[PDB]
Ligand binder design. Structure first.
Ligand code: CLA
Ligand code: CLA
Ligand code: CLA
Ligand code: CLA
Ligand code: CLA
Ligand code: CLA
Ligand code: CLA
Ligand code: CLA
Ligand code: CLA
Ligand code: DD6
Lengths: 161, 149, 81, 165
């Protein structure tokens, strides 16, 4: 907890005060981008941890070491790559309109709130339903981004542990 | 079971009830036909060399090689395409899930009888889906025939 | 046809497209994009194109990709209202 | 509310005044395009297919003159008629007629008021003599629809052998 207050050294949030005709992102866009990056980083941490030491999914070949995985993935299973790309494209397209409106303050959709509740959770009452767990998600996502950066840096220089 | 409201996930939120109920009805009807198409072919075989001793576990692939499956796919796909606006509109005023017409001449006018018949259809169709899942899985796992064991 | 706000009037799509409901345009655009990408990939990516490999069908499919973009834009315009 | 498909509501733009109306627009095509254009397309397809069915049957049974007689089955007629130039001539003349029909139909859809599938071609004046040409128009549309389906069949059947029925 960095003082339990907005931690913005270099003040990247405040530049929305200068209109700049919409050149500078509004805080909502940055918030949504941060949550996206955190979620991607945590799932990528799971992937790195397992694939680096893992039997790998039963399938054609699929012998990889987490750094050469994507070319092997594309070559061995073209249909799989095709459907992955198509599904991600569909998901991004369904949203994105709201993200486009989120560059300004016209998002109309709470940042990072997508229609994904496979298990209903209306228990929370404080602010946004269980706002505290939203903070938990963002925190572990920040840490996951740190972890992805750490593995990528350890790649070139054995930076640490 | 009886007077039991399950929906443990609670999917009504962020969803259209009429859409899901129409989906349920179509699934149910096709699964009932699936159960009887499982049962009958073994006892009774359509005339023709192609339709002889194909077996039910291996029916799909063999008939895909031959004409039949493509034909039935074409006709069912045509009917499904024809039925697009009914699903897309999701209008309450529009006919409730299931065809409003084509009902046999012997359909009770009483609203209570309509509810009873619709409930019977839904229950026997849910049994259909469960029954076919068991049937095909036990068909592939075990031997062949109506017992599937 | 000058328009302000966040969604253009349907008349921009022309006499025919402007009457098509959004889901129809969306499905048509998906089909067109799939066919066009598949055609462009089958020739010159998955298979090298030669003098005696010019399929008119693949050329039409490849031309169908800009149609897919136009139809997806039109579908969004119809969706906003 | 549709006579053909009662599940669907009565399609818009299909008032019933048009001959051959059975309220069949399950995909709502009529709403998409100007109706008179679609009607002209239907009538033209039907006329062409009536002519095509008659030609297929006649060629399969009887043949015109030498060169034309050698080709026999209509399957191997496009090629032969291309070779000795008949296709080029009929293409030229049909193209001239269609080109004039372009401006003819452009006048329509702009308020000219031409009836769909209307020309001055009534030398025997069957419809002109009869005040009730609705019977004739409905018959034309229905026999043309049957001809469309029948030609589609005949072609896709003879392309797979099946000799002659
Ligand atoms: C690269 C992705 C990314 C993005 C787009 C953001 C974006 C944001 N962060 Mg986050 N953050 C990130 C990575 C990211 N952060 C990482 C890796 C860490 C760990 C060091 C943090 C730790 C962090 C804290 C502790 C805080 C932010 C805050 C903010 C907001 C203001 C600062 C800013 O403009 O950041 C660019 C903004 C929504 C502040 C906030 O809530 O907004 C006022 C805040 O208090 N971030
Ligand atoms: C045996 C091969 C095989 C088959 C039959 C399927 C079948 C299916 N996949 Mg695919 N898939 C495969 C291998 C296969 N997958 C592989 C190897 C990968 C890894 C790259 C994927 C990654 C993948 C994704 C990312 C998604 C699917 C989805 C789906 C389902 C939606 C319909 C569709 O065509 O897509 C369908 C049941 C979708 C799904 O699960 O929706 C329910 C979806 O989003 N697939
Ligand atoms: C400039 C091209 C362009 C334009 C104007 C649009 C516009 C639109 N798209 Mg499409 N789209 C595009 C490219 C484009 N898209 C591409 C390349 C893909 C991937 C194949 C998609 C995939 C896609 C999906 C799957 C969906 C949309 C949807 C939409 C609509 C709402 C969402 C949206 O705009 O943000 C979405 C944001 C993006 C897709 C990011 C695109 C960013 C591009 C790549 C940047 C390139 C532009 C660049 C600045 C041009 C510089 C040129 C210069 C060098 C000469 C909107 C009408 C949605 C829709 O129609 O719903 C009804 C929808 O579901 N789009
Ligand atoms: C190992 C093979 C195998 C497999 C894949 C299945 C799988 C299945 N069985 Mg079967 N079953 C098995 C062995 C198996 N069973 C054995 C050894 C017996 C005792 C003889 C049964 C007796 C049995 C009955 C009596 C019924 C099922 C039913 C079902 C289905 C219902 C699943 C459910 O609700 O709970 C998971 C399911 C697909 C039910 C069904 O088909 O529909 C409900 C049903 O009524 N099973
Ligand atoms: C960022 C990219 C971008 C975006 C978002 C738009 C957005 C738009 N354009 Mg423009 N346009 C662009 C780039 C772009 N344009 C470029 C680079 C060109 C070529 C120089 C055009 C040429 C163009 C024309 C000629 C027309 C539009 C029209 C339109 C509008 C509706 C789209 C439509 O009817 O297509 C729907 C398209 C189809 C259903 C099928 C298209 C088949 C292919 C493309 C041929 C919409 C406001 C229309 C409009 O509003 O004018 C009144 C119109 O007539 N655009
Ligand atoms: C190219 C052939 C063709 C054309 C242009 C039309 C056009 C039309 N028909 Mg006809 N029709 C046809 C073939 C055709 N039909 C055939 C083969 C049959 C079966 C014998 C019928 C039976 C039929 C009935 C019973 C009715 C119509 C009606 C209509 C009108 C509204 C529907 C529409 O827009 O369809 C779009 C049409 C298409 C053919 C193209 C879509 C094809 C996709 C790719 C599949 C329109 C004038 C309705 C009407 O108002 O009567 C005048 C009506 O009640 N048609
Ligand atoms: C769609 C309309 C259509 C088209 C494209 C053709 C096209 C053709 N016909 Mg057919 N034909 C048609 C209608 C049509 N006909 C009708 C309605 C009749 C009945 C009067 C005939 C009777 C007919 C005969 C008797 C013969 C042809 C022949 C031919 C070929 C040479 C042209 C010729 O001599 O015709 C005039 C050519 C492939 C000739 C040929 O070479 O056969 C293939 C030939 O011998 N046609
Ligand atoms: C065999 C069925 C059939 C029937 C009942 C009709 C009936 C009709 N046609 Mg059609 N027509 C047919 C076949 C048919 N035609 C074929 C095969 C062709 C292609 C050569 C045409 C080409 C055609 C044209 C080009 C025109 C007609 C016209 C007419 C109308 C007046 C002509 C007349 O005396 O009627 C018999 C009438 C409603 C005319 C019309 O509607 O305007 C008066 C008109 O302009 N028809
Ligand atoms: C009025 C039209 C008509 C009639 C009477 C038939 C009648 C028949 N068809 Mg044909 N068929 C039709 C239209 C028709 N078909 C159309 C429109 C198509 C294209 C979609 C086909 C394509 C078709 C194929 C591909 C085959 C048949 C076959 C058959 C036979 C079963 C039967 C004689 C079969 C056959 O050849 O049996 C002799 C067969 O294999 N049908
Ligand atoms: C005229 C008229 C009317 C009418 C009418 C009528 C009678 C309509 C008739 C419709 C009709 C008769 C439609 C036939 C379809 C045949 C199909 C779809 C074939 C698919 C064929 C397929 C899928 C082929 C596959 C195969 O080839 C493959 C690949 C290899 C071979 O081993 C053979 C097989 C087959 C296996 C209305 C309706 C009353 C209204 C109107 O107002 C007036």
């Amino acid at each position: 907890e960095t003082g339990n207050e907005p931690w913005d050294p270099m003040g990247f949030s405040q530049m929305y005060k200068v209109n700049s005709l919409g050149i500078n992102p509004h805080p909502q866009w940055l918030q949504e981008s941060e949550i996206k990056h955190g979620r991607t980083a945590m799932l990528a941490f799971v992937g790195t941890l397992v694939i680096h030491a893992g039997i790998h999914i039963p399938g054609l070949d699929y012998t990889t070491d987490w750094y050469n995985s994507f070319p092997e993935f594309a070559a061995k299973n073209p249909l799989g790559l095709a459907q992955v790309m198509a599904g991600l494209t569909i998901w991004e397209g369904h949203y994105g309109t709201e993200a486009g409106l989120m560059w300004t303050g016209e998002g109309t959709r709470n940042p990072g709130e997508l229609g994904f509740d496979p298990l209903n959770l209306m228990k929370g009452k404080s602010e946004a339903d269980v706002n505290t767990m939203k903070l938990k998600e963002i925190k572990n996502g920040r840490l996951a981004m740190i972890a992805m950066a750490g593995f990528a840096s350890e790649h070139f220089i054995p930076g640490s542990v | 079971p009886t007077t039991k409201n399950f929906d443990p996930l609670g999917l009504a939120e962020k969803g259209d009830v009429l859409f899901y109920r129409e989906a349920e009805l179509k699934h149910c009807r096709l699964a009932m036909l699936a159960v009887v198409g499982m049962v009958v072919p073994n006892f009774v075989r359509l005339p023709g060399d192609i339709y002889q001793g194909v077996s039910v576990v291996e029916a799909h692939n063999a008939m895909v090689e031959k004409g039949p499956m493509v034909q039935l796919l074409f006709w069912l796909s045509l009917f499904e395409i024809i039925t697009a606006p009914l699903t897309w509109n999701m209008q309450a005023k529009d006919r409730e899930p299931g065809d409003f017409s084509l009902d046999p001449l012997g359909f009770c006018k009483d609203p209570e009888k309509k509810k009873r018949y619709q409930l019977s259809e839904l229950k026997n169709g849910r049994l259909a889906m469960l029954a076919f899942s068991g049937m095909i899985t036990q068909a592939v796992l075990t031997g062949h025939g109506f017992p599937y064991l | 046809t000058y328009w302000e706000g966040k969604a253009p009037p349907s008349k921009v799509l022309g006499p025919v497209v402007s009457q098509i409901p959004s889901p129809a345009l969306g499905v048509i655009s998906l089909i067109c994009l799939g066919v066009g990408t598949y055609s462009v990939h089958e020739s010159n990516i998955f298979h090298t194109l030669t003098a005696d490999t010019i399929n008119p069908g693949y050329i039409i499919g490849s031309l169908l990709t800009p149609v897919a973009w136009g139809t997806h834009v039109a579908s969004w315009i119809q969706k906003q209202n | 509310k549709s006579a053909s498909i009662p599940f669907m509501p009565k399609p818009e733009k299909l008032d019933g005044t048009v001959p051959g109306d059975v309220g069949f627009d399950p995909l709502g095509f009529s709403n998409w395009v100007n109706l008179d254009f679609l009607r002209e397309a239907e009538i033209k397809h039907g006329r062409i297919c009536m002519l095509a069915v008659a030609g297929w049957v006649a060629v399969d049974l009887g043949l015109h003159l030498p060169g034309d007689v050698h080709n026999v089955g209509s399957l191997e007629a496009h090629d032969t008629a291309v070779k000795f130039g008949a296709m080029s001539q009929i293409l030229l003349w049909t193209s001239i007629f269609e080109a004039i029909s372009t401006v003819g139909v452009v006048q329509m859809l702009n308020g000219s008021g031409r009836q769909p599938g209307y020309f001055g071609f009534d030398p025997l004046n069957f419809s002109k003599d009869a005040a009730s040409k609705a019977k004739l128009e409905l018959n034309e549309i229905k026999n043309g629809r049957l001809a469309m389906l029948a030609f589609s069949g005949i072609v896709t059947q003879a392309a797979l052998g099946n000799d002659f029925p």
